Design an enzyme around this catalytic site. Sequence first.
Site, PDB file in Angstrom:
ATOM      1  N   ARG A   5      28.962  41.469  39.103  1.00 11.47           N
ATOM      2  CA  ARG A   5      28.969  41.866  40.518  1.00 11.47           C
ATOM      3  C   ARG A   5      29.904  41.065  41.417  1.00 11.47           C
ATOM      4  NH1 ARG A   5      22.656  41.644  41.054  1.00 11.47           N
ATOM      5  NH2 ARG A   5      23.061  40.391  39.168  1.00 11.47           N
ATOM      6  N   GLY A  18      24.529  31.143  38.727  1.00 11.72           N
ATOM      7  CA  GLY A  18      25.151  30.237  37.781  1.00 11.72           C
ATOM      8  C   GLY A  18      26.527  29.792  38.241  1.00 11.72           C
ATOM      9  N   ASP A  27      29.812  46.998  34.921  1.00  8.36           N
ATOM     10  CA  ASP A  27      28.576  47.761  35.066  1.00  8.36           C
ATOM     11  C   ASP A  27      28.604  48.788  36.200  1.00  8.36           C
ATOM     12  OD1 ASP A  27      27.159  46.429  32.929  1.00  8.36           O
ATOM     13  OD2 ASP A  27      26.942  44.699  34.284  1.00  8.36           O
ATOM     14  N   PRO A  66      26.150  34.844  30.638  1.00  9.91           N
ATOM     15  CA  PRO A  66      26.068  35.615  31.880  1.00  9.91           C
ATOM     16  C   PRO A  66      25.191  34.920  32.910  1.00  9.91           C
ATOM     17  CG  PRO A  66      24.429  36.430  30.377  1.00  9.91           C
ATOM     18  CD  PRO A  66      25.135  35.277  29.660  1.00  9.91           C
ATOM     19  N   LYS A 103      22.284  45.342  23.690  1.00  9.21           N
ATOM     20  CA  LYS A 103      21.025  44.618  23.452  1.00  9.21           C
ATOM     21  C   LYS A 103      20.150  45.279  22.387  1.00  9.21           C
ATOM     22  CE  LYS A 103      21.101  42.179  27.841  1.00  9.21           C
ATOM     23  NZ  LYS A 103      22.421  42.784  28.180  1.00  9.21           N
ATOM     24  N   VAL A 104      20.762  45.524  21.239  1.00  6.23           N
ATOM     25  CA  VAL A 104      20.159  46.293  20.171  1.00  6.23           C
ATOM     26  C   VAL A 104      18.802  45.689  19.816  1.00  6.23           C
ATOM     27  CG1 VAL A 104      20.536  47.181  17.855  1.00  6.23           C
ATOM     28  CG2 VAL A 104      22.482  46.860  19.370  1.00  6.23           C
ATOM     29  N   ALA A 105      17.755  46.508  19.817  1.00 10.22           N
ATOM     30  CA  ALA A 105      16.397  45.971  19.758  1.00 10.22           C
ATOM     31  C   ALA A 105      15.425  46.917  19.067  1.00 10.22           C
ATOM     32  CB  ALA A 105      15.915  45.641  21.173  1.00 10.22           C
ATOM     33  N   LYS A 159      33.117  43.441  28.830  1.00  7.02           N
ATOM     34  CA  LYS A 159      31.786  43.773  28.342  1.00  7.02           C
ATOM     35  C   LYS A 159      31.370  45.094  28.967  1.00  7.02           C
ATOM     36  CE  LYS A 159      27.896  41.753  29.781  1.00  7.02           C
ATOM     37  NZ  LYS A 159      27.071  42.963  30.091  1.00  7.02           N
ATOM     38  N   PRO A 213      30.354  28.572  37.512  1.00  4.94           N
ATOM     39  CA  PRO A 213      31.359  28.742  36.455  1.00  4.94           C
ATOM     40  C   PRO A 213      31.658  27.441  35.714  1.00  4.94           C
ATOM     41  CG  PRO A 213      32.070  29.838  38.459  1.00  4.94           C
ATOM     42  CD  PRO A 213      30.847  29.043  38.821  1.00  4.94           C
TER      43      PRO A 213
HETATM   44  O1  LIG Z   1      20.485  37.134  30.020  1.00  6.58           O
HETATM   45  C1  LIG Z   1      21.298  37.993  30.342  1.00  6.58           C
HETATM   46  C2  LIG Z   1      21.966  38.776  29.386  1.00  6.58           C
HETATM   47  C3  LIG Z   1      22.867  39.718  29.819  1.00  6.58           C
HETATM   48  O2  LIG Z   1      23.554  40.475  28.950  1.00  6.58           O
HETATM   49  N1  LIG Z   1      23.082  39.918  31.162  1.00  6.58           N
HETATM   50  C4  LIG Z   1      24.069  40.941  31.541  1.00  6.58           C
HETATM   51  O3  LIG Z   1      25.229  40.262  32.076  1.00  6.58           O
HETATM   52  C5  LIG Z   1      25.673  40.939  33.280  1.00  6.58           C
HETATM   53  C6  LIG Z   1      25.345  40.103  34.520  1.00  6.58           C
HETATM   54  O4  LIG Z   1      26.136  40.724  35.539  1.00  6.58           O
HETATM   55  P1  LIG Z   1      26.168  40.013  36.983  1.00  6.58           P
HETATM   56  O5  LIG Z   1      27.352  38.953  37.014  1.00  6.58           O
HETATM   57  O6  LIG Z   1      26.467  41.227  37.972  1.00  6.58           O
HETATM   58  O7  LIG Z   1      24.869  39.371  37.302  1.00  6.58           O
HETATM   59  C7  LIG Z   1      24.947  42.298  33.301  1.00  6.58           C
HETATM   60  O8  LIG Z   1      25.686  43.261  32.528  1.00  6.58           O
HETATM   61  C8  LIG Z   1      23.611  41.976  32.599  1.00  6.58           C
HETATM   62  O9  LIG Z   1      23.114  43.170  31.979  1.00  6.58           O
HETATM   63  C9  LIG Z   1      22.430  39.145  32.061  1.00  6.58           C
HETATM   64  O10 LIG Z   1      22.622  39.269  33.257  1.00  6.58           O
HETATM   65  N2  LIG Z   1      21.551  38.205  31.651  1.00  6.58           N
END
Ligand SMILES: O=c1cc(O)n([C@@H]2O[C@H](COP(=O)(O)O)[C@@H](O)[C@H]2O)c(=O)[nH]1
Lengths: 218, 218
Positions: free
Chosen positions: B196, B180, B13, B173, B65-67, B35, B182
């Site tokens: 991130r 979260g 991202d 994610p 996130k097609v909506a 992704k 792993p």
């Molecule tokens: O429920 C969801 C669904 C996602 O796609 N995402 C996506 O997953 C990624 C999370 O990235 P990060 O590890 O920096 O928090 C981002 O691209 C976000 O748009 C999310 O964080 N939560």
Amino acid sequence: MDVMNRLILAMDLMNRDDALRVTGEVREYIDTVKIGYPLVLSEGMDIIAEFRKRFGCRIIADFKVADIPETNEKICRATFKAGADAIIVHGFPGADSVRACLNVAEEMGREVFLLTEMSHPGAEMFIQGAADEIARMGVDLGVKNYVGPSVRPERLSRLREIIGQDSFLISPGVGAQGGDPGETLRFADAIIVGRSIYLADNPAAAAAGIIESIKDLL
Amino acid sequence: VMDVMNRLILAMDLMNRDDALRVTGEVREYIDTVKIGYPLVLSEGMDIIAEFRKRFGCRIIADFKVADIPETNEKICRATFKAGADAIIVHGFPGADSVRACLNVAEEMGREVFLLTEMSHPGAEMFIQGAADEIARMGVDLGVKNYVGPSVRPERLSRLREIIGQDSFLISPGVGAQGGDPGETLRFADAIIVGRSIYLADNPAAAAAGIIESIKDL
Ligand SMILES: O=c1cc(O)n([C@@H]2O[C@H](COP(=O)(O)O)[C@@H](O)[C@H]2O)c(=O)[nH]1
Ligand SMILES: O=c1cc(O)n([C@@H]2O[C@H](COP(=O)(O)O)[C@@H](O)[C@H]2O)c(=O)[nH]1
């Protein structure tokens, strides 16, 4: 927002030549174009600046923003960098995700439109039952611009009731999906029209026809 | 199902091509699945997919996130697959027709749909959480095989896995920056999505290697 003829063109053609030609053909009738992912993903975000250069129209980026707050902020920043005047955001992902968009819009001198209920049959499964609450959420957040469905006038009327007469309301599903221009403008400030115009043998005549049918509402 | 190296998917991202390419290259030996979302695509164009495929041996999941309504969803999928995405992520909350539209294009074009059932951010509690079990069950009824669910609520991730069954593919994610874990996440998900905590690290390679070390027995 002052939309010429209460009519917003949904430019969902996916070829740059066709999109520019057709928009040019109806330029005398509109000053507001909704550009979505079908065009942007086919031709690039530079197409927004190109529309501004050619037509001077205002541009609403219909990106149905529906991510987490952090990503929403990024999406809005990229979108406004490209020259969009406004962006459409889903309300279903909740208040924090909407607020992220409101933040960037305020920072760059742009507007957020909140999508509260949609026009397709699937909207009945989950969105419709949440729609009134999503609208109240918009009111709580200070959202002034809303999107609701032409195809269910009783639902569009309820949305107008919730947000009040001061808020700005635009409405898709006119023409191709069965919505009527005049009935829709009982509640919405402007109608959004795509296929009925851009797939017409003569887009200009199609636009003129729609406008003729609502002339007393202009 | 897709064979995701090290059960780890990079959420790329970053919004600058040079940085996105540098970081992805640095973690290339740990990750074969990337992704790509709208932050990068809206900043650099759909050709970024082509460039990632050229530069790296990585599958691409388009997190769009097609909506939208079924007709627009079809156009978005076509444009996305034309650009070289292996898969696209679609929201379930707009209902079954909108999802089926994506499934139909994916079938025709030889690619895959992932269904997003619940989300990881606080706002997800307002509307999405209450619909999530039914969205998941709808996915199963539609024959969806790939799913996305949140790592940050293990009880919810567990329920989603139950609904979709052991044969379905599930990615998750919210690992790292959103809190979260792993290991705990991989109790239920096939693969974790991490953005991130890798792409903002001083040494993204060390960051990826560290995550992989923490889940070595898995
Ligand atoms: O429920 C969801 C669904 C996602 O796609 N995402 C996506 O997953 C990624 C999370 O990235 P990060 O590890 O920096 O928090 C981002 O691209 C976000 O748009 C999310 O964080 N939560
Ligand atoms: O509920 C909604 C919300 C939308 O943005 N739209 C959008 O409005 C436009 C409708 O175009 P059309 O007049 O061809 O049906 C499309 O761009 C679609 O994505 C919709 O149809 N229903």
